[PDB]
Design a protein around this ligand. Structure first.
Ligand SMILES: Cc1nn(C)cc1C(=O)NCC1CCC1
Length: 169
């Protein structure tokens, strides 16, 4: 079963107005098979609107393209992003809930470091008693880690099934 198409799209902002469907394709085919590749244009002038999207055959190919940032396409550094949810923002921090009183920093680090480079791990404690409250925040150096994390259906850390959400600052 193919992964859902929505999870195989990369939305590319910041394009050069000279980038075409064809030149965007030739660039991003370096990291996988593309089933779709679109530059958005004005319906009347045909002038570029400066953004588009590509669709890879697999999620691993999306990962390969994101791991190859920064992407300079037709002379300009562009901004690729995975699909955002409706309401959500592009952030570098997550809330991790349901970790209870026995989960330590190294449990969170060993798991989440495989999504991206961690900068801060904050295990929350009670302001009055100092006891652990059962949730934590993890900050990464880049938003794609968070984008990969929050689209997973399940997160298991230290045996616990955790609730993970984007955290706004
Ligand atoms: C979801 C989503 N997440 N991001 C970052 C962009 C989208 C999106 O739906 N873009 C609209 C299409 C691009 C051609 C029209």
């Amino acid at each position: 079963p193919k992964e859902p198409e929505q999870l195989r799209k990369l939305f590319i902002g910041g394009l050069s107005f000279e980038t075409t469907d064809e030149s965007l394709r030739s660039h991003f085919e370096q990291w996988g098979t593309l089933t779709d590749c679109v530059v958005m244009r004005d319906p009347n002038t045909k002038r570029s609107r400066g953004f588009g999207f590509v669709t890879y055959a697999t999620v691993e190919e999306v990962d390969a393209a994101m791991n190859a940032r920064p992407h300079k396409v037709d002379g300009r550094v562009v901004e690729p992003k995975r699909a955002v949810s409706r309401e959500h923002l592009t952030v570098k921090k997550i809330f991790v809930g349901g970790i209870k009183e026995d989960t330590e920093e190294h449990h969170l680090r060993d798991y989440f470091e495989q999504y991206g480079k961690i900068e801060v791990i904050e295990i929350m404690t009670d302001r009055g008693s100092g006891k652990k409250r059962g949730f934590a925040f993890v900050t990464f150096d880049d938003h794609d880690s968070v984008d990969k994390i929050v689209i997973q259906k399940y997160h298991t850390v230290n045996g616990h099934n955790c609730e993970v959400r984007k955290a706004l600052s």
